[PDB]
Amino acid sequence: MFENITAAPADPILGLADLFRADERPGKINLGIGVYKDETGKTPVLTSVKKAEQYLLENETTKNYLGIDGIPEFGRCTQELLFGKGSALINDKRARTAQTPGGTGALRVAADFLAKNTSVKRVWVSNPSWPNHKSVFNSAGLEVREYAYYDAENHTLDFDALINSLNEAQAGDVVLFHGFCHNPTGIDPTLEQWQTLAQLSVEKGWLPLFDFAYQGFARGLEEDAEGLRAFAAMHKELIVASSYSKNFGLYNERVGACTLVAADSETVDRAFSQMKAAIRANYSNPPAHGASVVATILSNDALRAIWEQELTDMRQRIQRMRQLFVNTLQEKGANRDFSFIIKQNGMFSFSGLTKEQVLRLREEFGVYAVASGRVNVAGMTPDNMAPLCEAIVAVL
Amino acid sequence: MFENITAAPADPILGLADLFRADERPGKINLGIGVYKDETGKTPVLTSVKKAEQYLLENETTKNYLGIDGIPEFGRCTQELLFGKGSALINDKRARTAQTPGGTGALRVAADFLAKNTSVKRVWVSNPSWPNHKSVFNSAGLEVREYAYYDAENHTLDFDALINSLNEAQAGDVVLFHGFCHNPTGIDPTLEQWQTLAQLSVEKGWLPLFDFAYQGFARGLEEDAEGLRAFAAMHKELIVASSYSKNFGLYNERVGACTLVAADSETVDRAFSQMKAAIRANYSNPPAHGASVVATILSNDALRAIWEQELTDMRQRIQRMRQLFVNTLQEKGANRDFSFIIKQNGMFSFSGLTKEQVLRLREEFGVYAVASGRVNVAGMTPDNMAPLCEAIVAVL
Ligand SMILES: *Cc1c(COP(=O)(O)O)cnc(C)c1O
Ligand SMILES: *Cc1c(COP(=O)(O)O)cnc(C)c1O
Numbered sequence: 001m002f003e004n005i006t007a008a009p010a011d012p013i014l015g016l017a018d019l020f021r022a023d024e025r026p027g028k029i030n031l032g033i034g035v036y037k038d039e040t041g042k043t044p045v046l047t048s049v050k051k052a053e054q055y056l057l058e059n060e061t062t063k064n065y066l067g068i069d070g071i072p073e074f075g076r077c078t079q080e081l082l083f084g085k086g087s088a089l090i091n092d093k094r095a096r097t098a099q100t101p102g103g104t105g106a107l108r109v110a111a112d113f114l115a116k117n118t119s120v121k122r123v124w125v126s127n128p129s130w131p132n133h134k135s136v137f138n139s140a141g142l143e144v145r146e147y148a149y150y151d152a153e154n155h156t157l158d159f160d161a162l163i164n165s166l167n168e169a170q171a172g173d174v175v176l177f178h179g180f181c182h183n184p185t186g187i188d189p190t191l192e193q194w195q196t197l198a199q200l201s202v203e204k205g206w207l208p209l210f211d212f213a214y215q216g217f218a219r220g221l222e223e224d225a226e227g228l229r230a231f232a233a234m235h236k237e238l239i240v241a242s243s244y245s246k247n248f249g250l251y252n253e254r255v256g257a258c259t260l261v262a263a264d265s266e267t268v269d270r271a272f273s274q275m276k277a278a279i280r281a282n283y284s285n286p287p288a289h290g291a292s293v294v295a296t297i298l299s300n301d302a303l304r305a306i307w308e309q310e311l312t313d314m315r316q317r318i319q320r321m322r323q324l325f326v327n328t329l330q331e332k333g334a335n336r337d338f339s340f341i342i343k344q345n346g347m348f349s350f351s352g353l354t355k356e357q358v359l360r361l362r363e364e365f366g367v368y369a370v371a372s373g374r375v376n377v378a379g380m381t382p383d384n385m386a387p388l389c390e391a392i393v394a395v396l
Numbered sequence: 397m398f399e400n401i402t403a404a405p406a407d408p409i410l411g412l413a414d415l416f417r418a419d420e421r422p423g424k425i426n427l428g429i430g431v432y433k434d435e436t437g438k439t440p441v442l443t444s445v446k447k448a449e450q451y452l453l454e455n456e457t458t459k460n461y462l463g464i465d466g467i468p469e470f471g472r473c474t475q476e477l478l479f480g481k482g483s484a485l486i487n488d489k490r491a492r493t494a495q496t497p498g499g500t501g502a503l504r505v506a507a508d509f510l511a512k513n514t515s516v517k518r519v520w521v522s523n524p525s526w527p528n529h530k531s532v533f534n535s536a537g538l539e540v541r542e543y544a545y546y547d548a549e550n551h552t553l554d555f556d557a558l559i560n561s562l563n564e565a566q567a568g569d570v571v572l573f574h575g576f577c578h579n580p581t582g583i584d585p586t587l588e589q590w591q592t593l594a595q596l597s598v599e600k601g602w603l604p605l606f607d608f609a610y611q612g613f614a615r616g617l618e619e620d621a622e623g624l625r626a627f628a629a630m631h632k633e634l635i636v637a638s639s640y641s642k643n644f645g646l647y648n649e650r651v652g653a654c655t656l657v658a659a660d661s662e663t664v665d666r667a668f669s670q671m672k673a674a675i676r677a678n679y680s681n682p683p684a685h686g687a688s689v690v691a692t693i694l695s696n697d698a699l700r701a702i703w704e705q706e707l708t709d710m711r712q713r714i715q716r717m718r719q720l721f722v723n724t725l726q727e728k729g730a731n732r733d734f735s736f737i738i739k740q741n742g743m744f745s746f747s748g749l750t751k752e753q754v755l756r757l758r759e760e761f762g763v764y765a766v767a768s769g770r771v772n773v774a775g776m777t778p779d780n781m782a783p784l785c786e787a788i789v790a791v792l
Contacts, residue, residue: 001568001603001633002658005513007666008673014464014681035460043460050453057449064431064439065647068410101497101650104680112535117401132676139508139677172397207397237397251461252684254497262398270403277404280528281535284500285410287683288648 012131012371020368028366029384029391031375034183034347035251036314041381046249048307052296056289063288068276070099070286077298078257081215082225082240089232093265096272098258098279099286103213103243104132106258110209110239111140112278113260114174117271120207123174124166126150128350128372130183130211133176145169150185152352155340157187163200171205177231179212179242180224184374186344188218194227202234212242216311217318218345236263244294246347247311253290314378318347321380325349328389334396347378357395365391408527408767416764424762425780425787427771430579430743431647432710437777442645444703448692452685459684464672466495466682473694474653477611478621478636485628489661492668494654494675495682499609499639500528502654506605506635507536508674509656510570513667516603519570520562522546524746524768526579526607529572541565546581548748551736553583559596567601573627575608575638576620580770582740584614590623598630608638612707613714614741632659640690642743643707649686710774714743717776721745724785730792743774753791761787 010018016032035043045053069075075097083089100106114120123137126149134144147169148161169175177197182188189197201208208231215224231238244255260275262268279285297303326338341349353361353373361367367388369375380388406414412428431439441449465471471493479485496502510516519533522545530540543565544557565571573593578584585593597604604627611620627634640651656671658664675681693699722734737745749757749769757763763784765771776784 001514001516002663002667005663005667005670008669011464011673011676014676017461017463033461043458045456045459049459053453057446057453060441062439063441063445063646063648065413065429065641067413068407101679101683102681104676105678108678118397120397132680135673135677139674245461250459252459252681254679254681254683267398267401271398271401273404274401277407277531278535280407280410280500281531282501282504283497283650283679284528285498285648285650287497287650287685289683289685 016368016370019362023366025366027387028368029379029388030368031379031388032368032370034246034376034378036246036249036347036378037381039317039381041384043249046307046310048297048303048310049248049250049293051303051306052293055296056292066099066285066288068098068279068285069096071288071291071295073299074099074291074295075257077295078242079259081221081298082212082242082259083229083232084222084225087232089261094263094268095259095261096268096275097260098272098275099291100256100258100279101254101283101287102245103211103241103256104136105254105283106241106243106256107133107136107211108139109258109275109279109282110241111137111142112282113275115140115142116278117274119172120174122170123176123209124169125176126178126182128184129176133211147175150187150350155187155343155352157189157193159189159193166200169204169206173206174209175201175206176209176211177227179210179215179228180218181214181346183213183346184348184370184372185350186346186348188345189227191226191230194230198231198234201231208235208238210238210240212240214246214346215242216247217315217347221308232261235261237261244290248294248297248307250290250293253293254287255290255294318378321377322349324382324385325377325380325389328385329392332386332389332393334389334393336396347376349375349377351375353392353395360395361391365394367391412764412766415758419762421762423783424764425775425784426764427775427784428764428766430642430772430774432642432645432743432774433777435713435777437780439645442703442706444693444699444706445644445646445689447699447702448689451692452688462495462681462684464494464675464681465492467684467687467691469695470495470687470691471653473691474638475655477617477694478608478638478655479625479628480618480621483628485657490659490664491655491657492664492671493656494668494671495687496652496654496675497650497679497683498641499607499637499652500532501650501679502637502639502652503529503532503607504535505654505671505675505678506637507533507538508678509671511536511538512674513670515568516570518566519572519605520565521572522574522578524580525572529607543571546583546746551583551739551746551748553585553589555585555589562596565600565602569602570605571597571602572605572607573623575606575611575624576614577610577742579609579742580744580766580768581746582742582744584741585623587622587626590626594627594630597627604631604634606634606636608636610642610742611638612643613711613743617704628657631657633657640686644690644693644703646686646689649689650683651686651690714774717773718745720778720781721773721776721785724781725788728782728785728789730785730789732792743772745771745773747771749788749791756791757787761790763787
C-alpha cells in the first residue's frame, strides 16, 4: 500500500531545525524558527510559568478528561485578552472559545468547522504569509487565494494594492487577517487602515478570520488587540485563532484558542456545538497542562504581574536587537540601507535577501534563515551579532 | 454565515458527562465515560506520574517546540511496548512513531495520511465499536463499513459471522481491529483466532489498523499485545494508534502514538514524511507534558516498577468489581444470569440493557450508562454497588 508514496518536501520552517541540528560546524547561528532567545541564546521556561507549574504539581488531584472545549476559565481569560474586560461581545454572550492544541490547532478546527458547516470554499491569505496557512486550509478542502500586501521595493504595506486585490473576494469568502506582528513581514496596518478594512469587509460580506499569534510583542497587550477590536465592533460574526506559544513561551505545550463570534447567544451556541463535533473527530479534547498554566497565571494577580513584565522584557530585548542589527550591518560595510528593519514589529525582520543568498549564508556561513529571507531578530544576541552581520555583508 | 447552522447531536459518551454534571440529585452514579475510579470513587493522578512531574519541574530548562513527531525516547519506548524489546520490526527499522494528542489524535492522523497518500477509501469497523470511530474516519473522507462481531444472544464473539462479513472487504481496504479489551463489548479473539485473522488479512490484501487503548488491562502488558504481535510477524505494513490515557491515567494530557510499519526502512521513512506533513497541517507538533511523563517513567527502572504495580492494582480492582457486580445483582433479585460479565476484559461490561432501560436508569435513578447498555465497571465501588444493583433490577 505504501510502495508508491512519494516523500513530502521538508517544511520550510520546521525542516530548518533538522538541518541546523546536524550541522557539525561550531559557530552556526539559528535565525529560522520563531522562538525567543534571551541574551545568552537560550529559550528559558518563564519564571511565572515555573511558578504556576509548581502550583499545579501541588494542587492537581486528577487527570480526568477536560470537556471538548477545555478549561472554562481559560476561555474566559482568553476573551478578555482579545476583546477587552467590559466588552459587549462578552456581556451579550456572543462568543464561545474552544481551548486547542496551539494556534495551528485553532486554525485547523476553524477550517474543518467552516468546510463542514458553511458555504465557504475560499480563504484569502496575504502575500506573503506564514507558510503553513495554505497547508492548513487545503487540508480541510478549502482553496487559498492571495491578496497583495507587501511592497518589497518600499518595504511598505501596499494598501491600495491590498484593497484592489480583495475586490476579487466574493460575499461569503473568508479573509484571513494577522492580528499584529505580521508573519513574515512585521508590517501591520495603522489603526485607520484597520478601520477602513473593517467597514470594507462588512460592506463586501467577508467573514474575518484572525490569526493572533503575537499579542504583546508590538506595543502591549491591549494595544496589540486594536485592529481586531475595531473589527469586533462592527461584525456580527468572526473567528479568532489565537496562540499562547510565543507570549507565554509555552511552545511545546500547545496552548491556543479558537473563538467563534455570532450575532447572538443562541446562534453562537448552535454554531459552537458543531465546532465541538469537529474537535471530537480530530483530537477529542485538549491537553490540560499548558492551558492550565495560562489560566493560573492570568487568574492570579501576582503571577500575572510577573508574566507581564517578562513579556515586556522579551519585547524590549527584540527592539534593542533590531537597532543593533541595523547599526552593525552599517558598520560591517553593508551597503544597503537596512533601516526599514527598525519599522517592523515582532520577532521577524523580512531582510530582502534572495533565495540564493539565504542558501549561501547557510552552506558557507552556517547562518540559518528562512528561504523567504525572513530572519528571527529574537535569535540575535550581542555575542552573535558581529559574525552574523559579517556573513550577511559577504553575500550581498 | 452561521444563521442556518444546525446544532450537533450530543456525543453519546462525552455528552453524558455534561448531563451527570447538572444532575442536582444527591446519589447519582456515573458509569458512562471510560475513566478509572479507585475504591473511593476518585480518579487520582498516579504516584509514578506525580513523581515524574516533580522531576520535570526540576529538570526542564526550555519549552522550545518538539519536532513534528515528538519526543524520540517516547517513540522508542512505545515500539518496545507494542512489539517487544528484541522485535525484528525494531531491529530492521521498519516502524516510525509519531507522538500524538491521545489515541484519537493518532486515529485522525492515520486517517488523514491514508486519505491523502493512498488508494484507501473504505475502513471496516466492528459492530459494535467505539462510537467515535465512524466520526474520525468520516472526517478524513473515508467511508465506514461494518463487520459482524458480537453475538448478543450468547454474549459471545461470533467468529464465523466476523469472517463471513469481512469477505465483502476488498484488497486495499483498511480493517480496524481493537488491540484488546474490546470497546464496548469486552469480548476479544483468542490467540488462535488472532492467528487466523492474521493469515486471512495477508491473503485478502487488507491493511490492518489497530486501535490499542487498553494495554495492561486484560492480563498484562506483554500478553495484551499478543494479537497485534501475531499480526506484525506476518504483515509488511500496518498502523497502530495507541493510547496512554487509560494505562497511565493521563486522560487530559493527551498522550498517544501513531506507529507506521512498512516493508523496509526506506519505504517507512518515505511514508512517514507524508504523515509528518499531515500532522503539521493539523496541530503542528505534539504537547510535551504527558508524553514526557510517559518517557520519564518508562525510562526509569524505579518509576517503571511503581507504575506497573499501579496498573496491576487498577486491573485487579476492576476484576473484583465485576465479580461483585454479578453477585449483588443475583442477590438483589435480578433474574437474568449476568454471569457473562465475568468473561469480559477491561473497564466495560456490555450489559444487554435496552435503550429505554438505560434511559429510565438515568431519569428515575440517576444511574448514567451509555445508551448502548455499556457500563463502566471501573466506576463501581463497594459503596455504590448496592444502590446501583437495586436500580438495575428495578428496570428489568
Ligand atoms: C506561531 C504562529 C502560529 C501558531 O503557532 P502554534 O505554535 O501552533 O501556537 C499561527 N500563526 C502565526 C502567524 C504564527 O506566527
Ligand atoms: C479511549 C479510546 C481511544 C482514545 O482515547 P484518547 O483519550 O483519545 O487517548 C481510542 N479507542 C478506544 C477503543 C478507546 O477506548
